[PDB]
């Protein structure tokens, strides 16, 4: 298991534009296109991302290319963020993947708002962090996914994904 396989499990793979859990236009492996309620706007963002007139459908390779780019940006956002970097540096390899997962889903800004959980993770207070992470809209809205990430932080193992 690795970050790529982990997120591919959490986000799935779709080759046509679809609406995410928040009702936003997305494609591929959780690649958000826009928060605009306009499909045309989504098709436009899509074509610009791919570099061709897609008509709202991409290929597998195309989805994977967006995904590599998105994973890279996620990590880079963490490393550039003053509140996130130190947490990330303190964690082991499995738990780093859980932090990337959250950043991919909610953006660096969203993640940095879990101040209190972040501090517990940095202190390596696993059970406490898990409890704090669960008191969030994130957990209430996408409970199965949040449970999987939380267990990852708690245990430092890939068991939730096995
Ligand atoms: Cl892009
Ligand atoms: Cl879920």
CA of 19 to the centre of ligand 2 (A): 15
- By CB neighbour count within 10 A (0-12 exposed, 13-18 middle, 19+ buried), where does 114 fall? buried
Q: Which residue in 5, 10, 11, 159 is the catalytic one?
A: 11
Give the closest ligand to the alpha carbon of residue 144. Answer: 2
Q: Are strands 14-19 and 25-28 parallel, antiparallel or unpaired?
A: antiparallel
Method used to obtain the model: X-ray
Question: How do strand 14-19 and strand 31-34 relate by DSSP bridges?
Answer: unpaired
Task: Count up the domains in the chain and report the number.
Answer: 1
Distance CA 97, CA 7 (A): 9
Resolution of the solved structure (Å)? 1.8
User: Is 90 assigned a ligand-binding role in the annotation?
Assistant: no
**Longest distance between any two alpha carbons in the chain, whole Å:** 49
d(CA 79, CA 16): 32
Between the CA of 68 and the centroid of ligand 1 the distance, in Å, is 11
Q: How far is the CA of 51 from the centre of ligand 2 (A)?
A: 32
Q: For the purposes of burial, counting CB atoms within 10 Å of the CB of 103, is it exposed (0-12), middle (13-18) or buried (19 or more)?
A: buried
5 classed as catalytic? no
Is 92 considered catalytic here? no
Full domain range(s) for residue 142:
1-162
CATH number at residue 97: 1.10.530.40
> Is 132 annotated as contributing to ligand binding?
yes
Asked if residue 153 belongs to a known ligand binding site, the reply is no
Would you list the DSSP string of 17-84?
EEE-TTS-EEEETTEEEESSS-HHHHHHHHHHHHTS--TTB--HHHHHHHHHHHHHHHHHHHHH-TTT
């Amino acid at each position: 298991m690795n970050i790529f396989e982990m997120l591919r499990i959490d986000e799935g793979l779709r080759l046509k534009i679809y609406k995410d859990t928040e009702g936003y236009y997305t494609i591929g492996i959780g690649h958000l296109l826009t928060k605009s309620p306009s499909l045309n706007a989504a098709k436009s963002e899509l074509d610009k991302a791919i570099g061709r007139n897609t008509n709202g459908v991409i290929t597998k390779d195309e989805a994977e290319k967006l995904f590599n780019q998105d994973v890279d940006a996620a990590v880079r956002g963490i490393l550039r963020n003053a509140k996130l970097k130190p947490v990330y540096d303190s964690l082991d390899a499995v738990r780093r993947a859980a932090l990337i997962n959250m950043a991919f889903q909610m953006g660096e800004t969203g993640v940095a708002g879990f101040t209190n959980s972040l501090r517990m993770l940095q202190q390596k207070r696993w059970d406490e962090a898990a409890v704090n992470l669960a008191k969030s809209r994130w957990y209430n809205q996408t409970p199965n996914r949040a449970k999987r990430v939380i267990t990852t932080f708690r245990t430092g193992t890939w068991d939730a994904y096995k």
